[PDB]
Amino acid sequence: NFQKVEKIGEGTYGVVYKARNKLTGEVVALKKITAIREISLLKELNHPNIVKLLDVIHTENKLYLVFEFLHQDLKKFMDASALTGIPLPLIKSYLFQLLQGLAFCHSHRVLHRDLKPQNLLINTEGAIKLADFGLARAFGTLWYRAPEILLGCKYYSTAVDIWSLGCIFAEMVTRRALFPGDSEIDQLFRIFRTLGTPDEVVWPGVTSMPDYKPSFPKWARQDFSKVVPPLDEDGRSLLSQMLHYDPNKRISAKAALAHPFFQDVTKPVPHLRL
Ligand SMILES: O=C(O)[C@H]1CSC(c2nc3ccc(O)cc3s2)=N1
């Protein structure tokens, strides 16, 4: 019933295929993986910045998700733009849209928990969409992981997606990953080395988190101007609020949309080689 066109890739739950409905002619993305009920609820989520979950297929005791198809992800686009960099107006537009998507999902009590360039999809009209929202909770790369997760907190908040987005924001600007850790501790220490080793002053409760060790080295925080040059102060300001250690102090998606950084936001058209 579905015609395997090509392997889009390998996800976190299963393998992804570009597929054609051998009846409707529809071109879709197919992912082969209490969960049934939960992901079925996700079908109701509709937002221009969220990849549409078309249908949930539970058959032969196996689970397929049918998604709206988009041709390119942010990862491939960043690689293709690595020489020149993505223009600031397009970076700003993408960030603005992504925050809209987060704000919508967060208002409906849906988290992503696993944001990364590979699940951010773009099209020819200058739109960008979040894929895999709510899949983490339903079904039960460390670079974009929030520090509270790395410190073994069992209870996640919307703030984890904001951290991830912040990391992706910085990566778009510098054309290099912000915290490319190769293990949980390397990831953690890369964060510490840049933002300063967290303490009770900046993050009340941190020394009581399950995987926190008093034996953590004490790195001083470095100037933000060194981290995302040559982003202007509006952008650096927004980023620092997205990268607060304390998830309670970390800026929400709705508040982020009101940041002065987005005062001159537009919607440019990217040139894609599809
Ligand atoms: O599944 C993942 O972990 C990451 C890597 S593969 C992937 C993709 N998801 C979609 C969803 C819809 C679509 O048209 C393309 C992709 S690629 N997201």
Question: Which of 35, 42, 96, 32 is closest to 64 using CA atoms?
Answer: 32
| Same-domain status, 147 and 235 | yes
| Same-domain status, 67 and 79 | no
Helix (H, G, I), strand (E, B) or coil at 20: strand
CATH code, domain carrying 35? 3.30.200.20
114 as an active site residue: the answer is yes
Helix (H, G, I), strand (E, B) or coil at 15: strand
CA 160-243-148 angle, 5° bins: 45
**Which residue carries 């950084």 as its tokens?**
261
CA distances for 3 relative to 17, 19, 22, 51, 56, angstroms: 9, 5, 6, 21, 17
DSSP state of 92: H
Binding-site residues for ATP, in ranges, read: 8-16, 31, 68-70, 73, 116-119, 132
DSSP code per residue over 21-73: ETTT--EEEEEE--HHHHHHHGGG---TTB--EEEEEEETTEEEEEEE--SEE
Q: Where in the sequence is the domain holding 23, given as residue range(s)?
A: 1-71
DSSP state of 142: -
Helix (H) or strand (E) holding 239: helix 233-242
Domain stops at, among 71, 102, 124:
71
- Contact residues of ligand 1, CB 6 A cut-off: 8-9, 11-12, 16, 29, 51, 67-70, 118-119, 121, 131-132
| Same-domain status, 112 and 100 | yes
Method used for this model? X-ray
> Dihedrals φ, ψ of 265, to 5°?
-65, 140
